[PDB]
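User: Here's a protein and a ligand (2-acetamido-2-deoxy-beta-D-glucopyranose). What would the complex look like?
Assistant: Let me lay out the input and then the predicted complex.
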Amino acid sequence: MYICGDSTECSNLLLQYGSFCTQLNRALTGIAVEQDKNTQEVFAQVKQIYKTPPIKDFGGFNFSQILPDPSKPSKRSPIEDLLFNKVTNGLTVLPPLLTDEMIAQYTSALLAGTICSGWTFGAGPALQIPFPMQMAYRFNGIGVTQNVLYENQKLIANQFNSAIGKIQDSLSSTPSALGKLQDVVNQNAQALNTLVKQLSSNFGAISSVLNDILSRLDPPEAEVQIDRLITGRLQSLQTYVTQQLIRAAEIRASANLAATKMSECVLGQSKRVDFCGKGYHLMSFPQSAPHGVVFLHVTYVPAQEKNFTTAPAICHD
Amino acid sequence: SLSSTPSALGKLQDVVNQNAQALNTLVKQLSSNFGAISSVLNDILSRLDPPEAEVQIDRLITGRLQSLQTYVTQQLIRAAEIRASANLAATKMSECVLGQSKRVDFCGKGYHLMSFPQSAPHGVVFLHVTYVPAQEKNFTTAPAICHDGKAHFPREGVFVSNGTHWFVTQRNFYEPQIITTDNTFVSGNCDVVIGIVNNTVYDPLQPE
Amino acid sequence: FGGVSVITPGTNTSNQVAVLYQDVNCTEVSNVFQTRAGCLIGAEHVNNSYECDIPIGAGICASYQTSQSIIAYTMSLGAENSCAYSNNSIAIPTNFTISVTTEILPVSMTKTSVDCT
Ligand SMILES: *[C@@H]1O[C@H](CO)[C@@H](O)[C@H](O)[C@H]1NC(C)=O
Ligand SMILES: *[C@@H]1O[C@H](CO)[C@@H](O)[C@H](O)[C@H]1NC(C)=O
Ligand SMILES: *[C@@H]1O[C@H](CO)[C@@H](O)[C@H](O)[C@H]1NC(C)=O
């Protein structure tokens, strides 16, 4: 339809070329399938759905900005709601297999599991644990004793709640915070606007409109002008598909990284420096976003220091 | 599982099939005219006068060259995908076969114990051996125990209660032990920790 | 001008098929179900959610179910579980198992060479 829309003679000439349309259709089908595999691999990592607990105050930690808000038509967190609000010829766009609601449901299940089971639910059955004890284990995971968390539990909960509020303000304030997703959308929009614009070119033909060639010229000449248009449109489709395959590979690499971060930082505590935020990693929380994922990385960062004299050992007896 | 379910090995078969299709497509393109009077170069040369044949042959040359470049381009992209897969396999080989990885779900579900490589046509199969909790019980807990006015915390474990006595266990396996001054450490008083529970702490030196 | 897709249980299961019109409204095209992914003809829609078998799109999947026919449904995402959050109790393993799983990765491509001449 792109090359020879509503033209029998053009289609008959297109059939003189090899299986280019078959290869192009297979490439685009393969890309669409890969995009659904990418979505499932990033979000569908846990096949058991955990319910949101009835409360938000887990040891003093306020999770109201990350957990779904049941009072809104869209069962999305305030942060997810912001993320969704900020991001906005023969051409068919297929829907995703997993809808935005299904992705939000997977994110919610991951948050509920993280809050009540820590990393346990991602590597075997889920085992309930009090949240301050989950944090105590996360502090031990970075070389800090349990007494630090319990003695400073109120301070830690307050810093956490303030940091989350800061995330909501930071995302709202900066237009570029979600630039990566808008850039992906804009690049694909440009690719399709260019592909459509290519249909208006002559490519050396007597006219860019196939129906004008058919009505103005006798078959012995019309076939020549049509063949010129076929060459131009086929080259344009091959260029488009090649660029889509390269972009698809880039997206696949991104999805693989997101899935790795999901399984290593949301379903566990990572010791890899700067893998999941700056500082010593404590925990992570996923959030759904259009065509992507947003990770909130909670880390421990030294705040104040004093200089002391030290020694490698003590000599006594 | 591998014997009875052939789809398990689909990842390797698809690579083989994709390359086979590309080669068959590449061969099939030789049968197309691309607008020429014939797909066979010898028919054009025998049927037409040289200056006419040159045009028909150049048309076939353009068609075949475009098909060959398309083949090479898709092979470069697929090869990049294979390279990424090989790099992941090498990373897993180095981190899980030659070591015990602490990365969650990097080498199997559960907590990683070990892995074993196996050769496969155009690829590698890893058998990942993991430790997975099977049975669980619910116990009452507390962040600390208050004894002589000081707060006791586990050194390497969690405090649990069985309804009448407090014990300290390892975190990944239920193994109750008497709570003693060797299993716990002391930091701070009983007033600061939220939810501290009063209990006896045994001193191994007092009987001796 | 939308595409036409054939949804089949497979030759070795049943010769019944459903036909999906990717973006054509059912008014323009008897088990006719209009979805966000197109007009699906031949599948019977049910309220029960099941694990996805043959994906259609926008959360809708189809499968061959019991008399026997193609059933269209909204896919289930997973099993339900109780989070059971408590501020004074912990679940601790008393027994364990050893699990062995399989991960399969491609390493190499068939080496080919094509003479341009
Ligand atoms: C959590 O914070 C929100 C504002 O960010 C507030 O409205 C809500 O009452 C808080 N909940 C608790 C339990 O502190
Ligand atoms: C707790 O364990 C101790 C030691 O085995 C035992 O004497 C006591 O009866 C147990 N209590 C309950 C409620 O099971
Ligand atoms: C633990 O589970 C295994 C399963 O193979 C079983 O054979 C064994 O008897 C169980 N032991 C206990 C103490 O539950």
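Summary: The beta strands of chain B are 111-120, 123-141, 145-146, 150-154, 158-161, 166-170, 173-177, 184-189, 197-198.
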